[PDB]
Short mmCIF file of C-alpha atoms and ligand atoms in Angstrom, two decimals:
data_model
loop_
_atom_site.label_atom_id
_atom_site.label_comp_id
_atom_site.label_asym_id
_atom_site.label_seq_id
_atom_site.Cartn_x
_atom_site.Cartn_y
_atom_site.Cartn_z
CA UNK A 1 -0.79 14.54 -5.93
CA UNK A 2 -0.20 14.05 -2.03
CA UNK A 3 3.17 14.78 -0.47
CA UNK A 4 5.15 11.71 -0.39
CA UNK A 5 8.91 10.87 0.76
CA UNK A 6 10.10 10.70 -2.79
CA UNK A 7 7.63 12.46 -5.17
CA UNK A 8 4.27 13.91 -5.36
CA UNK A 9 2.70 12.03 -8.21
CA UNK A 10 -0.73 11.39 -8.48
CA UNK A 11 -0.33 7.80 -10.50
CA UNK A 12 1.28 6.79 -7.34
CA UNK A 13 -1.96 7.66 -5.85
CA UNK A 14 -3.69 5.60 -8.66
CA UNK A 15 -1.72 2.58 -9.02
CA UNK A 16 -2.17 2.29 -4.92
CA UNK A 17 -5.77 2.06 -4.79
CA UNK A 18 -5.68 0.05 -8.22
CA UNK A 19 -3.55 -2.49 -6.51
CA UNK A 20 -5.68 -2.73 -3.67
CA UNK A 21 -8.68 -3.40 -5.50
CA UNK A 22 -7.04 -6.30 -7.92
CA UNK A 23 -5.46 -7.98 -5.02
CA UNK A 24 -9.39 -7.85 -3.10
CA UNK A 25 -10.66 -9.71 -6.21
CA UNK A 26 -7.50 -12.21 -6.38
CA UNK A 27 -5.43 -10.40 -9.11
CA UNK A 28 -2.16 -8.32 -9.00
CA UNK A 29 -1.32 -4.85 -10.49
CA UNK A 30 2.08 -6.70 -10.49
CA UNK A 31 4.57 -9.19 -8.77
CA UNK A 32 5.88 -6.59 -6.42
CA UNK A 33 2.06 -5.63 -5.74
CA UNK A 34 1.56 -9.46 -5.05
CA UNK A 35 4.88 -9.54 -2.85
CA UNK A 36 4.10 -6.82 -0.91
CA UNK A 37 0.11 -8.04 -0.10
CA UNK A 38 1.71 -11.71 0.93
CA UNK A 39 3.85 -9.63 3.19
CA UNK A 40 1.17 -7.77 4.91
CA UNK A 41 -1.22 -10.72 5.35
CA UNK A 42 2.42 -12.57 6.58
CA UNK A 43 2.93 -9.94 9.18
CA UNK A 44 -0.71 -9.91 10.53
CA UNK A 45 -1.14 -13.04 10.72
CA UNK A 46 2.11 -13.80 12.71
CA UNK A 47 1.46 -10.83 14.91
CA UNK A 48 -1.77 -12.06 16.40
CA UNK A 49 -0.72 -15.65 16.84
CA UNK A 50 2.75 -14.32 18.40
CA UNK A 51 0.79 -11.32 20.10
CA UNK A 52 2.76 -12.22 23.97
CA UNK A 53 6.03 -11.39 22.44
CA UNK A 54 4.91 -8.03 21.38
CA UNK A 55 5.77 -6.31 24.30
CA UNK A 56 8.23 -3.30 25.43
CA UNK A 57 10.31 -4.41 21.72
CA UNK A 58 12.46 -0.81 22.27
CA UNK A 59 13.71 -2.21 25.37
CA UNK A 60 14.22 -6.25 24.52
CA UNK A 61 15.84 -5.17 21.43
CA UNK A 62 17.77 -2.01 22.47
CA UNK A 63 16.71 0.05 19.69
CA UNK A 64 17.02 3.96 21.08
CA UNK A 65 17.07 7.29 19.23
CA UNK A 66 21.13 7.85 18.32
CA UNK A 67 20.88 3.62 18.04
CA UNK A 68 23.69 3.01 15.07
CA UNK A 69 23.25 0.54 12.19
CA UNK A 70 25.77 -1.63 13.89
CA UNK A 71 23.86 -2.24 16.94
CA UNK A 72 20.88 -2.36 15.34
CA UNK A 73 22.42 -5.42 13.10
CA UNK A 74 24.18 -7.69 15.99
CA UNK A 75 20.56 -7.31 17.45
CA UNK A 76 18.96 -8.29 14.83
CA UNK A 77 21.68 -11.28 13.82
CA UNK A 78 20.25 -13.06 17.08
CA UNK A 79 16.81 -13.67 15.27
CA UNK A 80 18.74 -15.56 12.44
CA UNK A 81 21.32 -17.27 14.38
CA UNK A 82 20.27 -20.27 13.62
CA UNK A 83 20.00 -19.78 9.44
CA UNK A 84 17.47 -17.53 7.57
CA UNK A 85 14.25 -19.04 6.78
CA UNK A 86 11.16 -17.44 5.54
CA UNK A 87 9.34 -17.26 8.91
CA UNK A 88 11.89 -15.19 10.47
CA UNK A 89 11.90 -13.21 7.77
CA UNK A 90 8.47 -12.43 8.28
CA UNK A 91 9.16 -11.99 11.94
CA UNK A 92 11.79 -9.55 10.92
CA UNK A 93 9.37 -7.50 9.48
CA UNK A 94 6.85 -7.61 11.75
CA UNK A 95 9.14 -6.83 14.73
CA UNK A 96 10.22 -3.54 12.51
CA UNK A 97 6.92 -2.76 12.27
CA UNK A 98 6.08 -2.76 15.92
CA UNK A 99 9.21 -0.99 16.68
CA UNK A 100 8.14 1.92 14.57
CA UNK A 101 4.34 1.94 16.42
CA UNK A 102 5.97 1.21 19.63
CA UNK A 103 8.37 4.74 18.63
CA UNK A 104 5.75 6.68 17.40
CA UNK A 105 3.66 6.15 20.63
CA UNK A 106 6.45 7.43 22.50
CA UNK A 107 7.18 10.61 20.42
CA UNK A 108 10.48 9.39 18.79
CA UNK A 109 8.87 9.70 15.66
CA UNK A 110 12.19 10.21 14.86
CA UNK A 111 13.19 6.89 14.68
CA UNK A 112 10.63 5.28 12.16
CA UNK A 113 12.79 6.28 8.83
CA UNK A 114 15.78 5.10 10.54
CA UNK A 115 14.69 1.97 11.15
CA UNK A 116 13.44 2.01 7.84
CA UNK A 117 16.83 2.92 6.17
CA UNK A 118 18.42 0.39 8.75
CA UNK A 119 15.95 -2.73 7.85
CA UNK A 120 16.78 -2.25 4.19
CA UNK A 121 20.21 -2.33 4.93
CA UNK A 122 20.13 -5.39 6.73
CA UNK A 123 18.08 -7.07 4.13
CA UNK A 124 20.44 -6.19 1.51
CA UNK A 125 23.32 -7.14 2.95
CA UNK A 126 22.24 -10.53 4.79
CA UNK A 127 19.28 -11.52 3.65
CA UNK A 128 19.17 -10.90 -0.57
CA UNK A 129 21.41 -13.48 -0.93
CA UNK A 130 19.34 -16.46 0.88
CA UNK A 131 15.86 -14.89 -0.83
CA UNK A 132 17.56 -14.97 -4.30
CA UNK A 133 19.15 -18.42 -3.88
CA UNK A 134 16.00 -19.56 -2.39
CA UNK A 135 13.59 -19.28 -5.66
CA UNK A 136 13.31 -15.02 -4.74
CA UNK A 137 10.16 -13.35 -3.40
CA UNK A 138 8.40 -15.16 -6.12
CA UNK A 139 8.68 -18.41 -3.88
CA UNK A 140 7.54 -16.35 -0.69
CA UNK A 141 4.08 -15.41 -2.86
CA UNK A 142 3.01 -19.23 -3.26
CA UNK A 143 3.96 -19.94 0.21
CA UNK A 144 2.15 -17.25 2.03
CA UNK A 145 -0.18 -16.28 -0.53
CA UNK B 1 12.92 -2.36 -15.39
CA UNK B 2 13.35 -3.31 -11.51
CA UNK B 3 16.79 -3.70 -9.30
CA UNK B 4 16.37 -5.75 -6.42
CA UNK B 5 17.81 -3.30 -3.60
CA UNK B 6 15.37 -0.73 -4.66
CA UNK B 7 12.66 -3.38 -4.44
CA UNK B 8 13.66 -4.45 -0.74
CA UNK B 9 13.51 -1.21 0.57
CA UNK B 10 10.10 -0.51 -1.64
CA UNK B 11 9.12 -3.59 0.58
CA UNK B 12 10.25 -2.31 3.59
CA UNK B 13 8.47 1.28 3.00
CA UNK B 14 5.19 -0.37 2.26
CA UNK B 15 4.94 -3.44 5.01
CA UNK B 16 5.45 0.13 7.89
CA UNK B 17 3.32 2.24 6.39
CA UNK B 18 1.05 -0.31 6.62
CA UNK B 19 2.08 -1.20 9.95
CA UNK B 20 1.77 2.34 10.98
CA UNK B 21 -1.68 2.89 9.34
CA UNK B 22 -3.21 0.33 11.78
CA UNK B 23 -2.26 2.31 14.61
CA UNK B 24 -3.59 5.82 13.32
CA UNK B 25 -0.44 6.42 12.30
CA UNK B 26 1.66 7.53 9.18
CA UNK B 27 4.50 7.50 7.06
CA UNK B 28 4.22 10.29 4.94
CA UNK B 29 1.41 12.27 3.87
CA UNK B 30 0.74 10.21 0.44
CA UNK B 31 0.71 7.17 2.80
CA UNK B 32 -2.52 8.82 4.59
CA UNK B 33 -4.18 9.39 1.77
CA UNK B 34 -3.69 6.13 0.35
CA UNK B 35 -4.83 4.52 3.37
CA UNK B 36 -7.87 6.73 3.72
CA UNK B 37 -8.57 6.21 -0.01
CA UNK B 38 -8.41 2.44 0.27
CA UNK B 39 -11.04 2.31 3.03
CA UNK B 40 -13.51 4.97 1.44
CA UNK B 41 -13.12 2.55 -1.25
CA UNK B 42 -14.41 -0.24 0.39
CA UNK B 43 -17.05 1.77 2.25
CA UNK B 44 -18.36 3.00 -1.15
CA UNK B 45 -18.51 -0.91 -2.97
CA UNK B 46 -19.86 -1.84 0.10
CA UNK B 47 -23.17 0.90 -0.38
CA UNK B 48 -23.20 0.85 -4.10
CA UNK B 49 -22.13 -2.77 -4.99
CA UNK B 50 -25.51 -2.62 -7.22
CA UNK B 51 -23.61 -0.20 -9.47
CA UNK B 52 -20.44 -2.49 -10.20
CA UNK B 53 -22.84 -5.03 -12.74
CA UNK B 54 -21.34 -4.80 -15.97
CA UNK B 55 -19.03 -1.71 -15.90
CA UNK B 56 -17.74 -2.89 -19.68
CA UNK B 57 -20.65 -2.26 -21.20
CA UNK B 58 -21.77 0.66 -19.81
CA UNK B 59 -19.13 2.63 -19.35
CA UNK B 60 -17.59 2.06 -23.41
CA UNK B 61 -14.27 2.19 -22.70
CA UNK B 62 -12.11 -0.17 -24.51
CA UNK B 63 -8.12 -0.53 -24.94
CA UNK B 64 -8.40 2.14 -27.99
CA UNK B 65 -10.36 4.49 -25.97
CA UNK B 66 -8.62 8.39 -26.64
CA UNK B 67 -8.38 10.06 -23.12
CA UNK B 68 -10.59 12.49 -24.40
CA UNK B 69 -13.22 9.81 -24.66
CA UNK B 70 -12.34 8.49 -21.24
CA UNK B 71 -13.17 12.04 -19.67
CA UNK B 72 -16.28 12.52 -21.47
CA UNK B 73 -17.62 9.55 -19.80
CA UNK B 74 -15.80 10.58 -16.10
CA UNK B 75 -17.17 14.25 -16.62
CA UNK B 76 -20.51 12.42 -16.95
CA UNK B 77 -19.85 11.00 -13.48
CA UNK B 78 -19.15 14.65 -12.01
CA UNK B 79 -22.45 16.27 -14.15
CA UNK B 80 -23.65 17.51 -11.33
CA UNK B 81 -20.55 18.88 -9.31
CA UNK B 82 -17.66 17.53 -7.37
CA UNK B 83 -17.78 16.45 -3.95
CA UNK B 84 -15.85 14.26 -1.90
CA UNK B 85 -18.34 11.24 -2.34
CA UNK B 86 -17.88 11.89 -5.95
CA UNK B 87 -14.40 11.12 -5.64
CA UNK B 88 -14.39 8.48 -4.05
CA UNK B 89 -16.74 6.79 -6.98
CA UNK B 90 -14.28 7.87 -9.32
CA UNK B 91 -11.84 5.50 -8.14
CA UNK B 92 -13.89 2.53 -7.38
CA UNK B 93 -15.36 2.56 -10.53
CA UNK B 94 -11.93 3.08 -12.14
CA UNK B 95 -11.07 -0.33 -9.67
CA UNK B 96 -14.31 -2.13 -11.05
CA UNK B 97 -13.42 -1.43 -14.25
CA UNK B 98 -10.00 -2.69 -14.06
CA UNK B 99 -10.86 -6.56 -12.57
CA UNK B 100 -13.46 -6.65 -15.41
CA UNK B 101 -11.13 -6.00 -17.55
CA UNK B 102 -9.15 -8.96 -16.05
CA UNK B 103 -11.56 -11.08 -15.81
CA UNK B 104 -12.12 -10.28 -20.01
CA UNK B 105 -8.64 -11.25 -20.59
CA UNK B 106 -7.92 -7.57 -21.51
CA UNK B 107 -5.37 -6.76 -19.50
CA UNK B 108 -3.87 -4.40 -21.22
CA UNK B 109 -6.88 -1.91 -20.31
CA UNK B 110 -5.79 -1.72 -16.79
CA UNK B 111 -2.50 0.32 -17.35
CA UNK B 112 -4.25 2.47 -19.48
CA UNK B 113 -7.08 3.22 -17.18
CA UNK B 114 -4.01 3.87 -14.37
CA UNK B 115 -2.65 6.79 -16.87
CA UNK B 116 -5.99 7.88 -18.04
CA UNK B 117 -7.42 8.32 -14.18
CA UNK B 118 -3.86 9.74 -12.98
CA UNK B 119 -4.10 12.30 -15.76
CA UNK B 120 -7.79 13.45 -15.01
CA UNK B 121 -6.93 13.50 -11.32
CA UNK B 122 -4.04 16.02 -12.22
CA UNK B 123 -6.08 17.82 -14.21
CA UNK B 124 -9.88 18.10 -13.12
CA UNK B 125 -9.94 16.91 -9.27
CA UNK B 126 -6.84 17.56 -7.86
CA UNK B 127 -7.25 21.40 -8.45
CA UNK B 128 -10.63 21.11 -7.03
CA UNK B 129 -9.17 19.37 -3.84
CA UNK B 130 -6.74 22.21 -3.25
CA UNK B 131 -9.60 24.61 -3.10
CA UNK B 132 -11.91 22.92 -0.67
CA UNK B 133 -9.25 21.83 1.85
CA UNK B 134 -6.33 20.03 0.25
CA UNK B 135 -5.30 16.43 0.65
CA UNK B 136 -5.20 17.16 4.57
CA UNK B 137 -9.08 17.45 4.63
CA UNK B 138 -9.59 14.32 2.86
CA UNK B 139 -7.38 12.26 5.70
CA UNK B 140 -9.46 14.18 8.15
CA UNK B 141 -12.99 13.11 6.16
CA UNK B 142 -12.09 9.63 5.75
CA UNK B 143 -8.61 8.60 7.18
CA UNK B 144 -7.77 7.02 10.28
CA UNK B 145 -6.30 9.44 12.43
C1 X0D C 1 11.86 -9.21 21.73
C2 X0D C 1 11.47 -10.24 20.81
C3 X0D C 1 12.01 -12.21 21.05
N1 X0D C 1 12.24 -12.89 20.12
C4 X0D C 1 10.90 -13.43 20.10
O1 X0D C 1 10.20 -13.04 21.03
N2 X0D C 1 10.27 -14.26 19.30
C5 X0D C 1 9.34 -14.61 19.19
C6 X0D C 1 9.11 -15.19 17.82
S1 X0D C 1 9.94 -15.66 16.97
C7 X0D C 1 9.47 -17.52 17.12
C8 X0D C 1 9.83 -18.26 15.54
C9 X0D C 1 8.28 -19.37 15.33
C10 X0D C 1 9.45 -17.25 14.29
C11 X0D C 1 9.28 -15.67 19.92
O2 X0D C 1 10.43 -16.70 20.15
O3 X0D C 1 8.11 -16.93 20.09
C12 X0D C 1 12.93 -12.89 19.01
O4 X0D C 1 12.50 -13.62 18.18
C13 X0D C 1 14.40 -11.94 18.43
C14 X0D C 1 15.15 -12.18 19.18
C15 X0D C 1 16.36 -11.60 18.84
C16 X0D C 1 16.33 -10.68 18.15
C17 X0D C 1 15.09 -10.10 17.62
C18 X0D C 1 14.76 -8.95 16.57
C19 X0D C 1 14.52 -7.96 16.06
C20 X0D C 1 14.86 -7.05 15.16
C21 X0D C 1 15.15 -5.70 15.60
C22 X0D C 1 15.03 -4.93 14.73
C23 X0D C 1 14.12 -4.70 13.87
F1 X0D C 1 13.69 -3.80 12.94
C24 X0D C 1 13.93 -6.13 13.28
C25 X0D C 1 14.05 -7.28 14.26
F2 X0D C 1 13.47 -8.70 13.77
C26 X0D C 1 14.01 -10.85 17.73
C1 X0D C 2 -22.66 2.55 -15.60
C2 X0D C 2 -23.17 3.74 -14.56
C3 X0D C 2 -22.32 4.06 -13.38
N1 X0D C 2 -22.52 4.84 -12.24
C4 X0D C 2 -23.63 4.50 -11.57
O1 X0D C 2 -23.92 3.44 -11.51
N2 X0D C 2 -24.10 5.21 -10.47
C5 X0D C 2 -25.22 4.72 -9.23
C6 X0D C 2 -25.20 5.46 -8.34
S1 X0D C 2 -23.41 5.45 -7.51
C7 X0D C 2 -23.65 6.43 -6.16
C8 X0D C 2 -23.22 7.67 -6.39
C9 X0D C 2 -23.28 8.38 -5.16
C10 X0D C 2 -21.91 7.70 -7.22
C11 X0D C 2 -26.55 4.96 -10.04
O2 X0D C 2 -26.57 5.74 -11.28
O3 X0D C 2 -27.46 4.65 -9.52
C12 X0D C 2 -22.32 6.19 -12.39
O4 X0D C 2 -22.71 7.05 -11.38
C13 X0D C 2 -21.52 6.61 -13.47
C14 X0D C 2 -22.17 7.26 -14.53
C15 X0D C 2 -21.16 8.17 -15.73
C16 X0D C 2 -19.96 7.86 -15.70
C17 X0D C 2 -19.40 6.47 -14.51
C18 X0D C 2 -17.96 6.76 -14.67
C19 X0D C 2 -16.64 6.16 -14.69
C20 X0D C 2 -15.66 6.14 -14.53
C21 X0D C 2 -14.66 5.56 -15.66
C22 X0D C 2 -13.49 5.00 -15.77
C23 X0D C 2 -12.75 5.59 -14.49
F1 X0D C 2 -11.21 5.28 -14.35
C24 X0D C 2 -13.48 6.17 -13.68
C25 X0D C 2 -14.88 6.22 -13.69
F2 X0D C 2 -15.40 6.99 -12.47
C26 X0D C 2 -20.12 6.50 -13.49
#
């Protein structure tokens, strides 16, 4: 298969394609596939609607090469200052996405895999308990799918 | 079975992959191939929708089908040679048969098809790809940067 970050399997490519085509017909490869698709669409809608807020995010959010997770965390804490909800979680993904895009634009491709790791960290440590306690991603799909 | 910390990471990588792809950027070669193939599949199905009527009764592939029979059926699609167009067709036909299998409440057939396709890709099509420009050539031909 094509070279991926963690393997190069042909199954992974097949499963990706089949997941896509099932979702187009209102079906799902799996619950994870359904969550992924729901979040993509949630992200798309949020970005179009709140497009004015997506300008020079690397500056406003202070994300540069050499940023450390602790700095990333203080920044993202501000988004959730008044509590966690699904809308803010969507925003978290969307802002993170826009930052990876901005990074590549600026020939700072090196930030992409670091932003991914920081997001994962923050999810695990700050958001997972709220998510679990509020129905899991199953509830997200019921609300945003 | 699963694990949620991995789940969260998977969600992150998926979303970022998607958002990068929209700007013509890519997470990895694997991600670039996934985008390109989804797109190629959409275009194939838009052009050849006529061929997707009652595939189940025509392709003679059921849950009890052996891989060798699956192989003989797919071989027929490539009877006159392998080309990029036909490799796209292979995915789209697999996709459509999966959707029908869901329509007919034979969901069990979906994972079987996935496994058969991964094997056929591994054994038949990927070797041809490697003689014809590699996955990088597929991305140049069907991808968005
Ligand atoms: C520069 C962005 C400022 N900002 C913002 O424009 N928000 C927008 C949309 S959020 C409103 C509700 C309905 C979801 C607004 O105020 O209209 C924020 O909400 C905000 C405030 C504080 C921190 C952050 C952040 C972040 C962040 C950084 C890295 C990362 F990977 C993910 C992130 F969310 C975002
Ligand atoms: C029921 C006939 C389906 N079929 C078809 O209608 N073709 C159309 C032309 S489609 C456009 C060209 C460029 C591919 C036709 O015959 O007019 C085929 O060409 C065909 C013939 C023989 C086998 C297959 C297949 C398959 C297949 C099954 C499972 C799977 F996972 C993947 C597959 F490709 C597809």
